[PDB]
Amino acid sequence: PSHVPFLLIGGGTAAFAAARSIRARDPGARVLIVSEDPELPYMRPPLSKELWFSDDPNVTKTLRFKQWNGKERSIYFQPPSFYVSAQDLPHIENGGVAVLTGKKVVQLDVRDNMVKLNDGSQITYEKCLIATGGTPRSLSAIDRAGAEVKSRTTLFRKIGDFRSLEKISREVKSITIIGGGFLGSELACALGRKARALGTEVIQLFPEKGNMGKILPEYLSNWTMEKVRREGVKVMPNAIVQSVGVSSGKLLIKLKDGRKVETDHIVAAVGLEPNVELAKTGGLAIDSDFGGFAVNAELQAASNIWVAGDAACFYDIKLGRRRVEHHDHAVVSGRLAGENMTGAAKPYWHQSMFWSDLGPDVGYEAIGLVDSSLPTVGVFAKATAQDNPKSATEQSGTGIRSESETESEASEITIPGEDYGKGVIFYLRDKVVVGIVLWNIFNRMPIARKIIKDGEQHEDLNEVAKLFNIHEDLEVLFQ
Numbered sequence: 001p002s003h004v005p006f007l008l009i010g011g012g013t014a015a016f017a018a019a020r021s022i023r024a025r026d027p028g029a030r031v032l033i034v035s036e037d038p039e040l041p042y043m044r045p046p047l048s049k050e051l052w053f054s055d056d057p058n059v060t061k062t063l064r065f066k067q068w069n070g071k072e073r074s075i076y077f078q079p080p081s082f083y084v085s086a087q088d089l090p091h092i093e094n095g096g097v098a099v100l101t102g103k104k105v106v107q108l109d110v111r112d113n114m115v116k117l118n119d120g121s122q123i124t125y126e127k128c129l130i131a132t133g134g135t136p137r138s139l140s141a142i143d144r145a146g147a148e149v150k151s152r153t154t155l156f157r158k159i160g161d162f163r164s165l166e167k168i169s170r171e172v173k174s175i176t177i178i179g180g181g182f183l184g185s186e187l188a189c190a191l192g193r194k195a196r197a198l199g200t201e202v203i204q205l206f207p208e209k210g211n212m213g214k215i216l217p218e219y220l221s222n223w224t225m226e227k228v229r230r231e232g233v234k235v236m237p238n239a240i241v242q243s244v245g246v247s248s249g250k251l252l253i254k255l256k257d258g259r260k261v262e263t264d265h266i267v268a269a270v271g272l273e274p275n276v277e278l279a280k281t282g283g284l285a286i287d288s289d290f291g292g293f294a295v296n297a298e299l300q301a302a303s304n305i306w307v308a309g310d311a312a313c314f315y316d317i318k319l320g321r322r323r324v325e326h327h328d329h330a331v332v333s334g335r336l337a338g339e340n341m342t343g344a345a346k347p348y349w350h351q352s353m354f355w356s357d358l359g360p361d362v363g364y365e366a367i368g369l370v371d372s373s374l375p376t377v378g379v380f381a382k383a384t385a386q387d388n389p390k391s392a393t394e395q396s397g398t399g400i401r402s403e404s405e406t407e408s409e410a411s412e413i414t415i416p417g418e419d420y421g422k423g424v425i426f427y428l429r430d431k432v433v434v435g436i437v438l439w440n441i442f443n444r445m446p447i448a449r450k451i452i453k454d455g456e457q458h459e460d461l462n463e464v465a466k467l468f469n470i471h472e473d474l475e476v477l478f479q
């Protein structure tokens with residue numbers, strides 16, 4: 001196509017949400033998604049979670065996973081039949097959504113409302129969304145290593161990485177994960193379970209004192225490290241990689257403190273950089289504090305260019321300028337971007353949530369500014385039988401926790417197995433709650449949103465914690 005009315009760059013979560021938002025507000029709209037990957041839009045969270053807890057050899061082909069409750073779901077947002085071909089898109093009655101797979105936008109000419117693809121073709125647009133997501137960080141130690149080291153290092157991001165790494169876990173004796181964050185720890189538990197059944201080894205190493213140690217308070221970071229160790233994973237905290245080489249066919253990791261780790265394959269999960277390469281020819285601002293395209297309240301980066309998802313550095317209604325790596329944010333900001341591309345002129349006021357499941361038994365949710373260097377008030381309780389991701393998925397029918405929590409924010413609230421197993425952690429700044437972590441507490445994110453939006457100087461967080469830990473039959477009106 002040489003001209004399209006709506007052009008979405010990137011075919012991930014934010015792009016799909018915007019495409020559907022445009023079609024709802026502008027029925028008959030013609031929307032083209034350009035996607036460098038071969039697959040139609042799909043969600044990422046199952047790649048590190050339910051797709052590993054199957055023992056079904058066919059999921060690498062069907063990309064249908066069993067949710068924790070046993071209900072199957074496609075990783076794809078919509079089947080192919082939902083889309084029209086790019087060739088038909090200009091002509092077909094009542095418009096549609098087409099995806100040009102296997103094509104990368106390599107240049108964006110803001111001034112001329114035009115993109116250029118890797119195959120040399122050019123497309124002009126009336127409205128454009130940048131939904132390019134991010135690019136995984138590597139380690140300099142792996143960068144300096146040889147081609148073989150790099151060929152045996154997985155930056156875990158996409159379906160292709162699930163497929164290749166799942167095969168490796170069936171075939172090798174030792175896999176090492178570098179990175180202690182949520183994704184690394186999800187993979188550690190996933191691989192850990194596979195290795196326990198096979199008799200093989202999984203190592204996880206990171207520089208913090210314990211898993212998710214930059215986010216969780218020390219008590220709960222250490223508990224998480226022991227949970228991962230009970231899955232059979234050798235967890236090595238306080239580990240700084242100095243070099244990686246090959247010796248006798250195996251990868252040899254040398255840590256700064258002198259320890260060595262011999263392993264067969266490496267998975268690095270040490271974060272990402274927003275993909276801002278299309279800023280290179282001008283017209284688009286970038287953020288240096290956090291990364292990403294700087295956008296205004298309506299998610300605009302230029303007169304007819306919007307940005308959504310991981311690539312956007314947006315103005316958080318509570319926290320100011322920030323970027324997130326949240327499925328929830330990609331969905332909500334993508335939808336809003338699509339609305340503003342059809343003239344809604346609405347600000348992005350959503351408080352994005354995050355969640356991580358380490359398995360059916362352990363999950364976390366996070367909202368706002370969740371930094372372990374802030375003072376935290378943790379209020380903990382014994383877990384009941386329903387305080388785990390599997391029960392939450394059984395109650396709601398989805399494992400996509402932003403869907404079971406919903407995007408909404410509570411408006412009014414009415415109040416009519418050997419130690420701690422859940423709790424709420426309040427992150428304080430200026431005597432105010434600026435972030436919350438929920439540990440095995442589900443269906444209360446709307447309440448966490450309300451507490452953070454109120455921003456009052458709370459005494460008796462002992463009492464507020466009861467809204468998360470204790471009260472069951474709360475009657476709440478959501479918005």
Ligand SMILES: Cc1cc2nc3c(=O)[nH]c(=O)nc-3n(C[C@H](O)[C@H](O)[C@H](O)COP(=O)(O)OP(=O)(O)OC[C@H]3O[C@@H](n4cnc5c(N)ncnc54)[C@H](O)[C@@H]3O)c2cc1C
Pocket residue numbers: 009010011012013014015034035036037043044045046047048103104105106131132133134156157158183275278308309310311324325326327328330353354355356357
């Ligand atoms: C393994 C994994 C597990 C996750 N688990 C969770 C979880 O449990 N909870 C949670 O809240 N979040 C989770 N996340 C984060 C969440 O998936 C992301 O926030 C979400 O994918 C962001 O969507 P996006 O559309 O902004 O970016 P993406 O979904 O990455 O989409 C970007 C797409 O655009 C393509 N692209 C980039 N540049 C170009 C270009 N120039 N031309 C064409 N195409 C281009 C990319 O190849 C990619 O397909 C997880 C992420 C990963 C990788």
